[PDB]
Amino acid sequence: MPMQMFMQVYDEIQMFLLEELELKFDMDPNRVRYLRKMMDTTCLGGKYNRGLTVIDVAESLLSLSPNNNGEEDDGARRKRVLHDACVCGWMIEFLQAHYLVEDDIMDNSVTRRGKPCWYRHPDVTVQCAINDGLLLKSWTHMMAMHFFADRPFLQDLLCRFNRVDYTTAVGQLYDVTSMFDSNKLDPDVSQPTTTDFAEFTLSNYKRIVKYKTAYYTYLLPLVMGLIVSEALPTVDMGVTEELAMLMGEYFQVQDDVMDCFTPPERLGKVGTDIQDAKCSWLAVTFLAKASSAQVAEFKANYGSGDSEKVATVRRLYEEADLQGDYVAYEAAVAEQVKELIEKLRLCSPGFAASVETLWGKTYKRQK
Amino acid sequence: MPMQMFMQVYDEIQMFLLEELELKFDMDPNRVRYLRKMMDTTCLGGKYNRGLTVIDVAESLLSLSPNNNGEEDDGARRKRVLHDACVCGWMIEFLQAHYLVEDDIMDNSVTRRGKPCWYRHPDVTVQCAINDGLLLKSWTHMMAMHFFADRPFLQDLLCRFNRVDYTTAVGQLYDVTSMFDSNKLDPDVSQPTTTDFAEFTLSNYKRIVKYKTAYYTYLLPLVMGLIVSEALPTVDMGVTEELAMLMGEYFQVQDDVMDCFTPPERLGKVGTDIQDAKCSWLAVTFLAKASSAQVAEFKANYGSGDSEKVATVRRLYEEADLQGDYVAYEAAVAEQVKELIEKLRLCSPGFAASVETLWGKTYKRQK
Numbered sequence: 001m002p003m004q005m006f007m008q009v010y011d012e013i014q015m016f017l018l019e020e021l022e023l024k025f026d027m028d029p030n031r032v033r034y035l036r037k038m039m040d041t042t043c044l045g046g047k048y049n050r051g052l053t054v055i056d057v058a059e060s061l062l063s064l065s066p067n068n069n070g071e072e073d074d075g076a077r078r079k080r081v082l083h084d085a086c087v088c089g090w091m092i093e094f095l096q097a098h099y100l101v102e103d104d105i106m107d108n109s110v111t112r113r114g115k116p117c118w119y120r121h122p123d124v125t126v127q128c129a130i131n132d133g134l135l136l137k138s139w140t141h142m143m144a145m146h147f148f149a150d151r152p153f154l155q156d157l158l159c160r161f162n163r164v165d166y167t168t169a170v171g172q173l174y175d176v177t178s179m180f181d182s183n184k185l186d187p188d189v190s191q192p193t194t195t196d197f198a199e200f201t202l203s204n205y206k207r208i209v210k211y212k213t214a215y216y217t218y219l220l221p222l223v224m225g226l227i228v229s230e231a232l233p234t235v236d237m238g239v240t241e242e243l244a245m246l247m248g249e250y251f252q253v254q255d256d257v258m259d260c261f262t263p264p265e266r267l268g269k270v271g272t273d274i275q276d277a278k279c280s281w282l283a284v285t286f287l288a289k290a291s292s293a294q295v296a297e298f299k300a301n302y303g304s305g306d307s308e309k310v311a312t313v314r315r316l317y318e319e320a321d322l323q324g325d326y327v328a329y330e331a332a333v334a335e336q337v338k339e340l341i342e343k344l345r346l347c348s349p350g351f352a353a354s355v356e357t358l359w360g361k362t363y364k365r366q367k
Numbered sequence: 368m369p370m371q372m373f374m375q376v377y378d379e380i381q382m383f384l385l386e387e388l389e390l391k392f393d394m395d396p397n398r399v400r401y402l403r404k405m406m407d408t409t410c411l412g413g414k415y416n417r418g419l420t421v422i423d424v425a426e427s428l429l430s431l432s433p434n435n436n437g438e439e440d441d442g443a444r445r446k447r448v449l450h451d452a453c454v455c456g457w458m459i460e461f462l463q464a465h466y467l468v469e470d471d472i473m474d475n476s477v478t479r480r481g482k483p484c485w486y487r488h489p490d491v492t493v494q495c496a497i498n499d500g501l502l503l504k505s506w507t508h509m510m511a512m513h514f515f516a517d518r519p520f521l522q523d524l525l526c527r528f529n530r531v532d533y534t535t536a537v538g539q540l541y542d543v544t545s546m547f548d549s550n551k552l553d554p555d556v557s558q559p560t561t562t563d564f565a566e567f568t569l570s571n572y573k574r575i576v577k578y579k580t581a582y583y584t585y586l587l588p589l590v591m592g593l594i595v596s597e598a599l600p601t602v603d604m605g606v607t608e609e610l611a612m613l614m615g616e617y618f619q620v621q622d623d624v625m626d627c628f629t630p631p632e633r634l635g636k637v638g639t640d641i642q643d644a645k646c647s648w649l650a651v652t653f654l655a656k657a658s659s660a661q662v663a664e665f666k667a668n669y670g671s672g673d674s675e676k677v678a679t680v681r682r683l684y685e686e687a688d689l690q691g692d693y694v695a696y697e698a699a700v701a702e703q704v705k706e707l708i709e710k711l712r713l714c715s716p717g718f719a720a721s722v723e724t725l726w727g728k729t730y731k732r733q734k
């Protein structure tokens with residue numbers, strides 16, 4: 001049902017944008033075609049994990065103190081909240097859409113969702129792809145304003161949205177600057193490659209992971225479900241914030257691990273985090289426990305497309321039982337996520353349940 | 368023809384076991400009369416799909432790419448193999464009768480196959496029923512030793528056969544302990560049913576069905592077929608276990624679904640599973656696609672002798688469009704199962720057609 005609703009509003013959103021563009025922007029049907037296909041391609045074919053969350057949260061806070069006016073329960077709020085909930089859901093989805101479009105270019109990925117990255121479609125330049133990206137972020141604003149201009153929460157909605165928008169970009173700077181020694185970090189300064197791997201620290205890792213994934217993936221969807229429910233003050237931001245960060249860091253680590261050990265047929269993307277010399281969890285988790293010996297062979301094999309290097313990089317990781325360190329991680333995270341969510345239930349049992357469902361879609365995660 | 372020879376070997380095996388009981392174990396006619404009825408009630412009625420397959424695997428293999436060691440198309444081996452094939456089929460059919468006599472008590476079911484379960488029989492105490500099940504499994508060994516004495520494969524039949532026997536109890540343990548949190552599994556403290564239903568994952572489902580039903584339903588019949596026609600090396604096992612596993616998961620799922628929706632009439636019993644609150648395919652799939660709100664009510668009702676709460680479960684199953692997922696489940700299996708057969712059909716057509724008739728009698732399961 002929720003995906004039923006959710007998808008109904010997708011079609012609604014797509015129609016407004018596309019039609020707005022042609023009635024008020026002077027756009028030919030051709031380009032509209034392009035934009036219509038761009039949107040579909042980058043915005044559909046996913047989990048709708050973030051989108052679906054906002055809805056579940058919304059519809060879950062609905063029951064308790066349903067806004068509270070003068071009426072003996074009215075299903076006009078139930079309906080007005082889950083349309084809003086749906087729009088916010090899509091605001092999140094177009095937002096990630098934008099970042100993934102820009103990310104693949106950046107990470108130079110060649111595929112995603114079993115299909116080529118947007119910027120790798122035969123009929124798409126990268127120049128156009130970079131702006132298709134911008135377009136996706138702008139869509140989120142046209143749609144928020146188009147459907148929320150009469151909502152008293154619009155100011156708060158969009159302020160929290162853009163902060164998280166900003167937070168994810170900070171995260172991407174941390175991400176993208178994790179291969180070059182900070183002290184050198186200087187535009188005017190000739191291309192410092194990725195010599196020594198200091199700053200490939202768990203400390204350093206947690207921080208890029210937090211801002212680049214946790215917030216737009218776990219905090220933002222919950223927060224936005226609160227807001228369209230007018231139940232934001234209803235809930236402990238501290239606990240909530242603590243779970244999102246937790247859940248959000250465990251989720252990235254997962255894609256970091258799935259990146260190395262899951263088959264692309266399952267994954268979609270062809271794992272290259274190695275080759276890209278990415279600061280993945282395996283990477284930092286390895287170097288902190290790897291003998292002096294082990295750490296050398298890593299340094300000589302990491303960040304390379306050589307068919308015999310990566311494989312060796314998959315060996316040291318195997319060797320070192322990184323595969324085991326994960327499970328331990330996974331369980332610690334699991335313990336605290338459950339202690340945290342319990343603190344929630346007390347005061348916020350309605351809310352606390354949709355976090356659990358969110359935890360349900362994360363714990364599994366094998367894709 | 369197959370059912371023909373099949374049914375007279377039952378009378379053979381039964382002729383023998385009972386006389387061996389009367390001549391060798393000091394049994395009185397009163398008890399032989401008991402065991403005899405015990406054997407017919409619990410071993411007859413069904414459709415002998417397991418015990419018939421083995422014979423199809425046997426006839427096919429004795430033909431299409433048959434035994435080199437066999438002579439030049441002469442009716443002396445046909446008798447042995449097809450006979451052996453029958454003995455093997457009653458072994459697996461006796462195997463199931465054991466596991467059903469025990470499961471009914473465990474699962475606590477009122478009828479099976481249109482009749483009351485064995486332990487649900489007037490002069491059958493629950494206490495005698497447990498032993499009866501035990502006997503059922505001893506007979507499998509007795510008939511094997513008797514007929515396959517000379518048989519150069521006897522040790523291979525029995526070893527493998529016992530692997531699968533061991534693989535079903537394991538399965539049985541998986542099923543029977545998915546009602547509670549694995550973390551809190553310790554003989555010394557009270558066993559309270561889980562309220563979060565965390566253990567109901569597709570992945571967890573998958574495993575309790577692989578071991579509990581695929582191996583003896585789909586692999587054992589096959590493998591017996593091969594062994595008796597001394598053709599097992601000739602086939603790609605890896606592909607064979609794939610579809611045994613494929614077809615066996617599907618068969619259970621089918622069971623699981625029939626359990627909730629098939630009329631007890633067509634079905635052949637009352638629908639247990641919700642009351643019993645097991646980890647069936649439905650719950651696991653509902654639970655994974657349903658919302659916080661939906662889940663909470665399901666939670667409220669599921670696993671309770673009480674029609675009104677049972678009807679809800681049923682209600683948010685189909686209103687949760689669970690029959691669409693099934694159909695969509697069927698097709699994927701049918702697709703994938705349809706590729707492996709021709710993968711098997713390559714270096715061993717003969718087996719592949721026999722496997723195709725087992726598929727043939729699985730896809731269209733209307734019983």
Ligand SMILES: O=P(O)(O)C(O)(Cc1cnc2ccccn12)P(=O)(O)O
Pocket residue numbers: 099100103104107109168171172175212213255269
């Ligand atoms: O491409 P993926 O899915 O493998 C990847 O994990 C994507 C990802 C995570 N967080 C962000 C934030 C902005 C843009 C992309 N993001 P990563 O950052 O490793 O490329």
Ligand SMILES: O=P(O)(O)C(O)(Cc1cnc2ccccn12)P(=O)(O)O
Pocket residue numbers: 466467470471474476535538539542579580622
């Ligand atoms: O009672 P049924 O026939 O519906 C049931 O399907 C019984 C069943 C299936 N597979 C096994 C394996 C061992 C013992 C019993 N088994 P279930 O497991 O659903 O209880």
Ligand SMILES: [Mg+2]
Pocket residue numbers: 103104107109
């Ligand atoms: Mg990337």
Ligand SMILES: [Mg+2]
Pocket residue numbers: 103107175
């Ligand atoms: Mg990246």
Ligand SMILES: [Mg+2]
Pocket residue numbers: 255256259273
């Ligand atoms: Mg990644």
Ligand SMILES: [Mg+2]
Pocket residue numbers: 470473474542
């Ligand atoms: Mg059972």
Ligand SMILES: [Mg+2]
Pocket residue numbers: 470471474475476
């Ligand atoms: Mg049962």
Ligand SMILES: [Mg+2]
Pocket residue numbers: 622623626
């Ligand atoms: Mg059943």
